Symmetry: T
Subunit: 144 residues, 12 copies
Amino acid sequence: MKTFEILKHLQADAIVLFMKVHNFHWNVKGTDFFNVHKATEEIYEEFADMFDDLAERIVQLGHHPLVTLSEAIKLTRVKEETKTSFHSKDIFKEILEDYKYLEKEFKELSNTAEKEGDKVTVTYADDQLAKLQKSIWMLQAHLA
Amino acid sequence: MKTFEILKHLQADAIVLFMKVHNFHWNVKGTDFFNVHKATEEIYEEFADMFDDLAERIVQLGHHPLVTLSEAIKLTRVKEETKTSFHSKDIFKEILEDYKYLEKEFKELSNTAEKEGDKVTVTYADDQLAKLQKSIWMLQAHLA
Amino acid sequence: MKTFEILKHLQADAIVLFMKVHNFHWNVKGTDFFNVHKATEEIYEEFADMFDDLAERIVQLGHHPLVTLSEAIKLTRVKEETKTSFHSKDIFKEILEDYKYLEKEFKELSNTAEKEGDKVTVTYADDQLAKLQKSIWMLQAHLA
Amino acid sequence: MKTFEILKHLQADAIVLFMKVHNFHWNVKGTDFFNVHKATEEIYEEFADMFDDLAERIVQLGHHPLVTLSEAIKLTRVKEETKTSFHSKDIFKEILEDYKYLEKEFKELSNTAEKEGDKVTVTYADDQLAKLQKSIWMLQAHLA
Amino acid sequence: MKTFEILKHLQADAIVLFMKVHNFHWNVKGTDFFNVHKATEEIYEEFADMFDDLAERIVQLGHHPLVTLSEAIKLTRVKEETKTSFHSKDIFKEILEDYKYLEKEFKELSNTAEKEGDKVTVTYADDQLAKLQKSIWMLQAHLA
Amino acid sequence: MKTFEILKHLQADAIVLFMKVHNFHWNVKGTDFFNVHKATEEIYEEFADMFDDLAERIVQLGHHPLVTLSEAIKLTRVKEETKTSFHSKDIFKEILEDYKYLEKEFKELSNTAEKEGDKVTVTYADDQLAKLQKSIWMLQAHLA
Amino acid sequence: MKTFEILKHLQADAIVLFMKVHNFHWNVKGTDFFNVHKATEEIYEEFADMFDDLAERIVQLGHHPLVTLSEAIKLTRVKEETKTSFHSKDIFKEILEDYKYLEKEFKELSNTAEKEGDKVTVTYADDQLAKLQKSIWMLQAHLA
Amino acid sequence: MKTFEILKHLQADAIVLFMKVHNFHWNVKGTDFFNVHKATEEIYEEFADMFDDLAERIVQLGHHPLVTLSEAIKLTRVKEETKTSFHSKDIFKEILEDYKYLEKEFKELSNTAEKEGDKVTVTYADDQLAKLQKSIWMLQAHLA
Amino acid sequence: MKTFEILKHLQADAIVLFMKVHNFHWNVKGTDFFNVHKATEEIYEEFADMFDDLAERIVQLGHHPLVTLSEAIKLTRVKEETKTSFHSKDIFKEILEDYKYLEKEFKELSNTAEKEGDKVTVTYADDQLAKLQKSIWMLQAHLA
Amino acid sequence: MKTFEILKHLQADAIVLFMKVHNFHWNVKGTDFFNVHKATEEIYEEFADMFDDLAERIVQLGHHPLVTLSEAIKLTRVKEETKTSFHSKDIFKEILEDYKYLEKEFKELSNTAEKEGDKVTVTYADDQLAKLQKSIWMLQAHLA
Amino acid sequence: MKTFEILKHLQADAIVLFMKVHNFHWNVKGTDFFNVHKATEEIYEEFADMFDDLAERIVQLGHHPLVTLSEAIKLTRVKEETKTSFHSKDIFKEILEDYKYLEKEFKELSNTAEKEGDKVTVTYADDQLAKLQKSIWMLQAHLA
Amino acid sequence: MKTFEILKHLQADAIVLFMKVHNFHWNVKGTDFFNVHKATEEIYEEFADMFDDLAERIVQLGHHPLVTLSEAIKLTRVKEETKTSFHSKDIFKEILEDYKYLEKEFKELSNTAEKEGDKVTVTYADDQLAKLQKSIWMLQAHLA
Ligand SMILES: [Fe+3]
Ligand SMILES: [Fe+3]
Ligand SMILES: [Fe+3]
Ligand SMILES: [Fe+3]
Ligand SMILES: [Fe+3]
Ligand SMILES: [Fe+3]
Ligand SMILES: [Fe+3]
Ligand SMILES: [Fe+3]
Ligand SMILES: [Fe+3]
Ligand SMILES: [Fe+3]
Ligand SMILES: [Fe+3]
Ligand SMILES: [Fe+3]
């Protein structure tokens, strides 16, 4: 894809993930409650920021960002969670799965943005990669 | 409807509105840019909070909150905006329209919650009513 | 009862609960220690505030608040905990039991204060109800 | 009266009281000086806020707030203080008298706003009632 | 006039202006709303401070400050605004008119205080002159 | 007594004193109201902290802290106040009496903890002694 | 005197007054204790600053500031207080007496500095005059 | 050019732009005044920082930064503005023109620094590019 | 000269000095580095503020401030420094020389502004004089 | 040993423990991850401070602190951990073991410093003892 | 001496030292100016606190603190500095001399307070000893 | 080497340097004391952070970080300092030597990480390079 197309897909995943971790946030069960309730909030706050940055990068690039939830679920590569009750372990396995998926997408973003000579989208991609890789480590350590 | 059903519809509108004012936030054109770009951010921050409060009130009430964007666009009473370029005036007319709609919904919430004896949902509804009514005044003054 | 009588009973429970969660605070055992030690502190800080608000509302109402620990254990509906060692689970079951009891009492407070036309005691009662209901949800989610 | 008429009278009293406690603020005499000089400042800061809230509630309600000092002294139920020297005791007796008067007015506001179905003016009235009742207690305790 | 007489007239204008910019604050109409609503608040906050400083300078000088709204409208040189709806432009023209008037008064204050050897009233007058002159520039630039 | 026995008695007095100064806090009468209402709050906040520190020192020492209000009134050396109305002077005489009593107890604590080689309980005791002695001076100066 | 000579005398009074209000600070007796203990601290903090500013102005002026307590008691016009116990009233009468004395000295400073063309010492003098005159008013109101 | 030569030219433009936006800052006319007066201040604060960073990067690189205004106007590629009165629109068109020019220069900087293996100058260039591109978008949206 | 002409010359010196101390800031050599690097930054921050205040005072006065670096080097009385390496001592001698020059200019400003009756420019001049005289003392002490 | 010799051994253990809890910090596995990752950071921050305080106390005492990692592993009484993966339980058992060891060492420090008349090293030792004893309690409660 | 007599002598030295380091503060000459000017300020701020603590400890002990500068120079063991110009080195040698003297006095204080059983004066003495010993090290390192 | 091998060597140098600058921190002698004592603290705080970041990057990369001081001195390229007394100049020469060494290592890290496609390790390396190059400049300027 072109850089802006990768950006729009990533933007779609951000809003879908924002909704998804809210689900984990509200419906966690178990003696783990306080910690995951607290952690998921920080996570969706981050997706809200990513959602906004991706969209603004797209307009700076001269293109159209997704502007409706309808376009978003049409472009996501993230499956929506319909369940309404979870335990810590399952929540972290899913978040880990989605994080690994985002990491691949940001690597593509970084690679194709570089070929186009898009210096600033590349550094944006590399910064998100850094955050994702640190969290993936922590998620994996937690599940070990 | 029952209190929790009104809450779920309101929750649906919150996430749809969150997306909608982001659109206004990114695509404003005109010498008004900085102000509306700044204002819309405060507004969607508020919808993000409302979205979370509504959902948690629903689980406290023993019911299921919407957990997917798909359920959300199925329950909204808010029309999604597909346009990608706006001028201050049109943005504020739409926001005003949606605010007036939310005010009616929160009045129903307050009324039916009261009949059920749901004291805390009533005060929540009345607090949102207060914020909505102050903003509606400001929106109308702006368009005068 | 009359509003001030409900207030005095609630005041009695506040100081008894203040002592009770201190017990949980000092005597928790288990890998859960840090979290419950931290949580119980926030909880008894809250009871200390409730204890003071209830008492001052009573004097504003023209009556006498409980002024001795002796009157307090004579008026409580809360059983004192004599054990000196606990595990997370048992602590949260007890706190949940006591919270549910307080919720019923604050509902009575709200109801009878309303019949007397006591507008401000009603809003006080409804605010405490809101906090109690949110915590009851979290306590229950934790024990699930 | 209608809700907005009660609001305008209350608005009139707020600006008149704002001026009145400034008088006490500047002209206190006695070893009590620092405390009452400090207390009266907090009090008129509060009236300035009340003055603004009442007025904005009136415009939100679709009516006209008082916009001149002339209309204000025409609508007050508060007598203006012409003396320019006071001692702690007399200052607190007057403030107490005026507070008791405001409490009756806010009770009417709450009652008539409720009959009209004005949910948000009712909660505003009840919140002011709470503050007034706490201060009335303290004023009375001080004069005992 | 004598220094204290100029001070009392200025004190009268301060409370009248405090009321006047509140009117502009509540009744602005137009796409300018947020800015002037915000600006007028800062302005009346300033008049509230000026009102208090003038009055306290008068008592320090051994005289009586105005203590009633009635004395105030009897001493002002500022005309009260009876209209209840305005647009940015008209609001700023009026504020500018009143600021220019205050500047002349503070120049007289500074001049006559100096002849009396009143060192501290002179520096107070000169400081207000500085603030007034900066705002007059900004008001004029705005209307250009 | 043994160090932990002195600690438990002190813990008992802390909760009893916490209740006692709340009484003074709510029921002060007189032109002194604001100051003593404010001072008593700081004092019971301190007893709440002392109550918690004493108890935790006891568990660190391998013993059982008091965990019920019932055990507390069985171990106190502090008489509970049944009156519900006081004037500044009487409040400070009582607080002074109780402070002098606590000072003797902390001196014993310091002395016997030292004989046992309990270095940290000794420094805790000496720190409380410092605070008590400064307050006793201020209380006495106030009553002079 | 010459400006620097007035400055040195003022510097002498500052350190003597710093010591004097410490005496009032430590030895106040009476139900007024907390307030005057608190007020005197703010006052000597101010004298410490004045002491430093006066001295640095003298070196900026090319002269020698007092550098010993011995030179200070040789140059003061302030009588040292040998008593070690006071009541609020006597403390404020003395402070008032000394403040009135400082005001005369700062007026001379302002006058002679002006004749010499010393612009910055004049504004320093006038600023201190402002603070002194406000406090003198408050001291006098307190003693009325 | 060599990296340090591009850096010196950029440094020259920074100080020239610092002066230029001050002009816009002082001489804006129109109902837009407050906003552009505020915005231009943030902009020249940024140029002051850029000016300092560029210069220090040059010395770190072992070369000489421009040290006089004379060398600066000899090296700029930015035309100085001699007019002394402007309206919002013209100010933003000029700033936009200059920003687009800076963006091209920072792209060259990034490109040539990379060929030389200058890792840190490249990241500096890319960070400035990011800020410039976001502002260019906002400037363009404003002028649309 | 007329007040505004003195102001424009001072404005010219401010921007030239801003550039000059940046030179000292970047090119200091010696074990003194950290201190002078830190000090020079505070100094040019001050000149940036002075530059802005002078210019705005000129427009408030109804005249034109310098708006180009070209006009600035045409009006300065300050010689630009072309050297690119310095040691602490030489830097402070130059800064001292320039400060003494600014002091003379601000004295003229104060004197001629006074003759014109320009009260606020006089206090501005006297405030800068105060800062300059304190720094001149410190600079001289440093070089002694 | 002599006081300074005990101090050097303690200093050696501090840097070794600093490294050891970093290991636990990076290599924790399990659903406990976030908590122990967070806790271990606070712990090694503390050892870094202890390391610095011990060393500076030694130089104040006129002796040489350890200045190389080589001297440190030669003087420690703490065994280094070579494993690179742990679970909460094992981490806390080790930390507990090392804390108990440090407590014995600080008791010796306190005892021998006292015999030498080293007042300040004694209070330092007693303060560390206090922190260690509180943590040992919490560690033990956690493992129960 | 008795504890209170040692305290009074120490109190005398505190005010004399407060004056002495002010002298160093104002009259330092040399490229060291900024650092010692800054350091001496922190030092006399400390003596001001020590002066107040010593005095209040004396009244808590039931004795009379020095209340005049005259009593102070009669009790000091510190020689007053009459010179008005110094260089870094001489300032630090003197401060070091006086610090070593204070250390001996605080050791006596600690020793005799202990024999009297004065627990809190002992900890006060030991805390000052700690601060003095750290500064003595730094002073000596500086002079090496 | 492979990226993780370079990371482990860098991690080894970080802990060795952390110890080394502590030595400079404790043992500086000379009138430079305060500045270098303060500077070295900021430096070792930085190495502590670098030590932690390097180690966590290694685990994120799927490898083992150094977990013992023993492995560290086996892998460093940094020579340990055995001396216990230094003067400013020697301290800065050593730090400069070590910084230049770290810069070469981070350049290798950046280069080899890039060949492996390790985007985030590259940006980490480039950021450290930026900090190192700025400090190297300052160190060199200081020694000039
Ligand atoms: Fe945004
Ligand atoms: Fe939430
Ligand atoms: Fe209270
Ligand atoms: Fe308002
Ligand atoms: Fe006031
Ligand atoms: Fe605790
Ligand atoms: Fe100073
Ligand atoms: Fe810089
Ligand atoms: Fe400006
Ligand atoms: Fe240190
Ligand atoms: Fe004190
Ligand atoms: Fe870490």
